[PDB]
Design a protein around this ligand. Structure first.
Ligand SMILES: [Zn+2]
Ligand SMILES: [Zn+2]
Ligand SMILES: [Zn+2]
Length: 919
C-alpha cells in the first residue's frame, strides 16, 4: 500500500551495460521487502529463463520485459535518421539516428511469448550495427498482452520534448497509446536529479493530462546497491574502450541508478506526482504467472516416415536393414533378440524419432564424404545405434551395456550426438537446418563472462589507456600458471602467488586489482556454442527468444542449452573433431602416394606393427596416447590387444592413478604381480567379470555386472546403484547398502565379503570410467596408431598439416619425424601443395604452413602452376601471376620461407626484383 516495485531494470544480460546480477538483485529486492521486480534488458531477453526461475524459486513475482530499441523509421531502414539540428546531436535520436528506447513488459504469458518473438524479429530483420530494433508496425502486429510506456530519456517522447517538438511528442505518445491500448500505456517518470530529466518533466505531465495516461515512477536500475555505482562506471569503460581519467566518455550522473527502497522512492514522487509509485503496484498485481511458458512440452521433431508406417515401424525397418548391411551373411547369434529388446525400450520411452534423426544425419555425412567418428558416450552400448550407423562399435564383442545408455527403470533423456571432421561442421549444421526447418533449428548461445585474466587487462586499459599495456602485462605475468585452462578466481587471492605481494607493494596495482573484482563474472558478449544445436517440432520463435549472428546470418538461441532442454527442446552436439580431419588426411595421402585406398572400418584390431609401436611408446601425435607419463605407462604395459587400448584410456586418469591401478594393471598383465582378490569369498564369483582388467575394477559396467552377479540385481537397478554410489547422499547410500547387502546375504556371502566389496566400490565409483566411451576413444586411438605405425610419412604429413603455420607446435612433430628417419623437404613453389604431402618416403612442406599464405591464395598459385607452370625463374613466376598489392604481400613471405631456392637464386635479389615489378 506504501510499498514499491521496480519495473525498469538492467541485468548483467544488458551486456557491458547493466551490472545488476540476478542473484544479488533478488536478495536486495527481498530485504527491501518488495513483492515483485522487473527485467528490462537492452535489446534482448537472454536473462528471461534465469530471472523467471530464480524469482519463482524465491517467491518474488517476476515481471519480464525488455527495453526495446526502436528504429526512427522502418526497422528495415538502415539509413540513419535525425530529428533535430546538428546543434542538438546530444538530445537527438540515439545511436546517431539509429534508435530510441522503449520499456515493454508482459502482463501475462501471451504478452511474454509476444515479447519473445518481437525480440527475435528485431534481430532477424531490424538490425543496425549492434542494435536489434523493432518498429511501431511490428509491435502493433504482436501487441497483445504487453504493457509499454512513454520511456526513459532516450525514449521517443522525451527526445521530442528535448528537441523542442511538442506537437511530435504528443503525437508519438498517442500513436503508442493507440497500439497497446488505453490500459497498457504509462507515463514513465524517472528522477536522478539530472537537468535532462527536469527539462522534460512539465511537457511530460502535460501529455499525461492531455491523453489521459497514468503516471509510473521507475528508476532504470543499472546496479543493485549504491556502492555498486563505481563498478558500473568501470563497466561502461570496458564497453566504450575509454579511460576513467578521460572526462569525455559515456558515464552516468552520480550514483542514483540502484534499487532504491520503497521509502526513498516514495520520498521522490508521492508529493511531486501523486499516484506514480502506486501504479507500480497496480501493474505488479495485474501481472500473471508466466508458468505456461516454462512448462515442459514434447517438442522433439517427428521424423517423417513413409506412408503407412509410424516411428516405431520405421525404426524396426531401419534397424533390420541395418543389421543386414552390417552382417551381410546373417547376423550372428543373440543379435536379433538384443535388437528387439532395445527397440522395445526405445519405443517405450518415446524416442524412436531421435534415433531416426541421428541415423539420418550420419547417413547424410556419408553420402557427402564427411568422415564421422566411431562414436562417443553411452550410445556405443546400443546394438540399435550400431545397426543404424550412429556408432561403429559393435556393443556385443566389447561387452557394453545397453542399460547403461537407456535404463528402462529410469525416465531420462539420452545423449545421442554426431561427431565428425572438424572442417565440415558448417555443412552438417546447414544440412540439419534444411532437413528440419530453418525456423526450427538453431545453434546455441554462450555467454562470454569476464574471466580473471582479461578482468585485469580490462582494469588496466580503464585506468591507463593504450599505455596501460605495460602495467597490465606486468600484473598478468605474476599470475600462477593455469589449471590448465582456468586462471585463479580473483577473490581467491583473498594461493601460490608472488603477485599478491605485488599489490601490497604497489598502490596502483591494488587499485587495478580492486577494479577488476568489480568486473569479474559480468557478461561481455554473446557467443555461439562450439557444438550444441537445438531443434524443435515447432518454430523456435514460439518457444524462446532468438537472434541472427550478423556475420553469417546464423540463427542462435537466446538461452543456453540447459534452459532450452528444460522446456523440452531437443539438443544434439554436432561435434567437429580435428583428429578426424587428420585421419581423413592421412588416408588421402595413402591414396595419393601409395595407390592404396584404406578403409579403416575394416582394419583388423590385432595389427602386430601397431602394438609394437605402442610398446615403444612412440605415440606422439596418436590420439589420447601422447602424454609423457602415458608413454611411460604404455612402455611398462606392452599392450597386445584392443582391450589394452581401451584400459589405458580409463587407467590414465587421476582416480585410478591415485590407486596405482594403471601400474598394477601393467605389472599384473606381464606376470610381475599377483592378481589380488577383492576378498577370498569373492575371488571365484567375480573372477571372470574382472579378468580382462587383471582383477581390478576399471569400468562402470563392471560395477553393474558385479551387482548383478553377487547381489542379484537387475542391470537396470545396478545402473541406478552405480549412479547413486557416485553421488554419495547419506539417505540414498543407506537405502542402497540395505539392498546391496540383503542381496548378497541372500546369495550367501559373509558380512566380511559384503564389507570388502562395498568398501572397494564406494570410492571407486566417484571416478569409474564409462567403458563405452573408452571403446569409442580407444577405436580412434588404435586407428591413429595403426596409421602412424603402418604409414609413417602419410600420417605425420596429416599431423603437420593440422598444426597450421605455428612453428612451435610443428617443431614438436618435426623432431618426431627426424627420430623416425622421415626426411622433411622445405616449402617450395614447384613441389609444395597447400598441405604437407607424403612424397615417396618423404614429407614435403605445406605451402599454407608458411606465414601470410592461406588456401585462398595458394589455390590460385597451384591453379596457375597447373595451367602454365612450373615456374622456371622468379620473373617467370611474376609473368605467370597477377597484378595486386595483396599478391605482393604473399610473394614476400614465400621468398623468405625460401620457397624459391629451388630456382637457384639468392633471395635478397628477389626482394629487390619484386619491388620493381610492382611499380
Ligand atoms: Zn542502459
Ligand atoms: Zn533507457
Ligand atoms: Zn533502461
Amino acid at each position: 500500500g506504501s510499498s514499491f516495485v521496480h519495473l525498469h531494470n538492467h541485468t548483467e544480460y544488458s551486456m557491458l551495460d547493466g551490472a545488476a546480477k540476478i542473484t544479488p538483485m533478488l536478495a536486495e529486492v527481498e530485504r527491501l521487502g518488495m513483492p515483485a521486480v522487473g527485467m528490462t534488458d537492452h535489446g534482448n531477453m537472454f536473462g528471461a529463463s534465469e530471472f523467471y526461475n530464480s524469482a519463482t524459486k524465491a517467491g518474488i513475482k517476476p515481471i519480464i520485459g525488455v527495453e526495446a530499441y526502436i528504429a526512427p523509421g522502418s526497422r528495415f531502414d538502415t539509413r540513419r535518421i535525425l530529428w533535430g539540428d546538428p546543434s542538438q546531436k546530444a538530445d537527438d535520436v540515439s545511436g546517431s539516428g539509429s534508435y530510441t528506447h522503449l520499456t515493454m513488459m508482459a502482463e501475462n504469458a501471451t504478452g511474454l511469448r509476444n515479447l519473445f518473438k518481437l525480440s527475435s524479429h528485431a534481430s532477424f530483420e531490424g538490425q543496425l550495427s549492434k542494435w536489434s530494433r523493432m518498429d511501431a508496425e511490428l509491435i502493433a502486429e504482436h501487441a497483445e498482452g504487453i504493457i509499454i510506456t512513454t520511456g526513459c530519456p532516450s525514449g521517443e517522447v522525451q527526445t521530442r520534448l528535448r528537441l523542442g517538438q511538442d506537437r511530435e511528442a504528443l503525437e508519438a505518445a498517442a500513436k503508442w497509446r493507440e497500439i497497446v491500448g488505453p490500459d497498457n500505456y504509462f507515463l514513465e517518470l524517472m528522477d536522478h536529479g539530472l537537468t535532462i530529466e527536469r527539462r522534460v518533466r512539465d511537457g511530460l505531465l502535460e501529455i499525461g493530462r492531455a491523453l489521459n495516461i497514468p503516471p509510473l515512477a521507475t528508476n532504470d536500475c543499472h546496479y543493485v546497491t549504491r556502492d555498486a555505482a563505481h563498478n558500473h562506471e568501470a563497466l561502461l569503460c570496458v564497453q566504450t574502450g575509454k579511460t576513467l581519467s578521460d572526462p569525455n566518455r559515456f558515464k552516468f550522473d552520480g550514483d542514483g541508478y540502484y534499487l532504491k527502497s520503497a521509502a526513498e522512492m516514495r520520498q521522490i514522487w508521492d508529493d511531486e506526482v501523486p499516484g506514480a509509485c502506486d501504479s507500480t503496484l497496480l501493474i505488479a498485481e495485474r501481472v500473471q504467472s508466466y508458468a505456461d511458458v516454462w512448462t515442459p512440452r514434447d517438442r522433439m521433431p517427428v521424423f517423417p516416415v513413409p506412408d503407412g508406417h509410424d516411428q516405431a515401424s520405421w525404426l524396426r525397418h531401419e534397424v533390420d536393414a541395418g543389421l543386414r548391411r552390417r552382417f551381410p551373411a546373417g547376423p550372428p547369434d543373440g543379435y536379433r533378440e538384443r535388437a528387439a529388446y532395445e527397440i522395445d525400450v526405445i519405443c517405450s520411452k518415446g524416442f524412436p524419432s531421435y534415433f531416426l534423426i541421428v541415423a539420418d544425419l550420419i547417413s547424410y555425412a556419408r553420402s557427402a564424404g564427411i568422415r564421422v567418428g566411431p562414436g562417443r558416450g553411452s550410445a556405443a552400448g546400443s546394438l540399435v545405434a550400431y545397426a543404424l550407423g550412429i556408432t561403429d562399435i559393435d556393443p556385443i564383442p566389447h561387452g557394453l551395456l545397453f542399460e547403461r545408455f537407456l535404463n528402462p527403470e529410469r525416465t531420462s533423456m539420452p545423449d545421442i550426438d554426431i561427431d565428425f571432421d572438424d572442417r565440415r561442421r558448417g555443412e552438417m549444421v546447414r544440412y540439419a537446418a534444411d532437413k528440419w526447418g530453418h525456423d526450427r533449428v538453431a545453434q546455441v548461445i554462450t555467454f562470454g563472462t569476464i574471466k580473471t585474466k582479461a578482468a585485469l587487462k580490462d582494469s588496466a586499459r580503464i585506468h591507463y589507456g593504450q599505455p596501460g599495456f605495460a602495467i597490465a602485462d606486468r600484473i598478468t605475468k605474476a599470475l600462477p600458471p593455469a589449471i590448465m585452462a582456468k586462471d585463479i578466481p580473483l577473490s581467491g587471492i583473498t594461493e601460490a602467488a608472488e603477485v599478491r605481494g605485488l599489490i601490497e607493494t604497489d598502490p596502483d596495482v591494488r587499485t587495478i586489482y580492486q577494479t577488476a573484482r568489480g568486473l569479474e563474472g559480468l557478461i561481455r558478449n554473446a557467443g555461439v556454442h562450439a557444438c550444441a544445436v537445438i531443434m524443435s517440432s515447432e518454430p523456435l520463435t514460439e518457444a524462446i527468444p532468438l537472434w541472427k549472428r550478423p556475420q553469417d546470418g546464423a540463427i542462435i538461441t537466446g538461452w543456453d542449452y540447459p534452459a532450452c532442454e528444460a522446456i523440452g527442446l531437443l539438443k544434439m552436439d554436432f561435434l567437429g573433431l580435428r583428429n578426424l580431419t587428420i585421419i581423413g588426411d592421412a588416408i588421402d595421402n595413402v591414396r595419393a602416394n601409395r595407390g592404396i585406398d584404406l578403409d579403416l572400418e575394416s582394419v583388423p584390431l590385432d595389427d602386430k606393427a601397431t602394438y609394437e609401436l605402442l610398446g615403444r611408446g612412440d605415440t606422439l601425435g596418436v590420439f589420447q596416447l601422447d602424454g609423457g607419463p602415458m608413454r611411460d605407462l604404455l612402455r611398462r604395459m606392452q599392450p597386445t590387444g584392443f582391450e589394452d587400448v581401451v584400459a589405458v584410456i580409463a587407467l590414465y586418469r587421476p582416480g585410478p592413478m591415485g590407486m596405482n591401478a594403471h601400474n598394477d594393471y601393467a605389472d599384473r598383465k606381464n606376470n610381475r604381480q599377483a592378481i589380488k582378490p577383492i576378498h577370498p569369498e569373492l575371488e571365484e564369483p567375480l573372477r571372470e567379470i574382472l579378468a580382462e582388467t587383471y582383477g581390478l575394477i576399471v569400468y562402470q559396467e563392471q560395477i553393474m555386472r558385479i551387482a548383478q552377479k553377487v547381489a542379484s540385481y537387475s542391470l537396470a537397478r545396478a545402473d541406478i546403484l552405480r549412479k547413486a554410489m557416485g553421488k554419495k547422499k547419506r539417505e540414498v547410500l543407506e537405502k542402497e547398502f540395505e539392498g546391496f547387502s540383503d542381496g548378497m546375504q541372500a546369495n550367501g556371502f559373509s558380512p566380511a565379503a559384503i564389507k570388502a566389496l562395498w568398501d572397494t566400490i564406494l570410492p571407486f565409483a566417484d571416478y569409474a570410467f564409462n567403458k563405452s566411451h573408452a571403446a569409442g576413444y580407444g577405436m580412434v586411438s588404435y586407428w591413429t596408431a595403426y596409421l602412424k605405425a603402418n604409414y609413417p610419412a602419410e600420417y605425420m604429413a596429416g599431423l603437420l598439416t593440422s598444426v597450421g603455420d605455428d612453428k612451435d607446435k610443428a617443431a614438436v612433430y618435426l623432431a618426431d619425424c627426424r627420430k623416425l628417419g622421415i626426411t622433411v623437404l622445405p616449402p617450395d613453389v614447384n613441389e609444395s601443395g597447400l598441405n604437407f604431402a607424403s612424397v615417396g618416403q618423404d614429407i614435403r612442406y605445406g605451402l599454407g604452413a608458411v606465414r601470410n599464405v592461406g588456401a585462398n591464395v595458394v589455390g590460385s598459385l597451384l591453379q596457375t602452376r597447373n595451367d602454365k607452370g612450373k615456374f622456371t625463374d622468379f620473373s617467370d613466376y611474376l609473368n605467370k601471376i597477377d597484378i595486386s598489392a595483396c599478391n605482393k604481400k604473399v610473394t614476400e613471405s614465400l621468398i623468405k620461407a625460401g620457397a624459391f631456392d629451388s630456382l637457384g637464386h639468392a633471395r635478397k635479389g628477389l626482394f629487390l626484383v619484386h619491388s620493381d615489378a610492382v611499380d
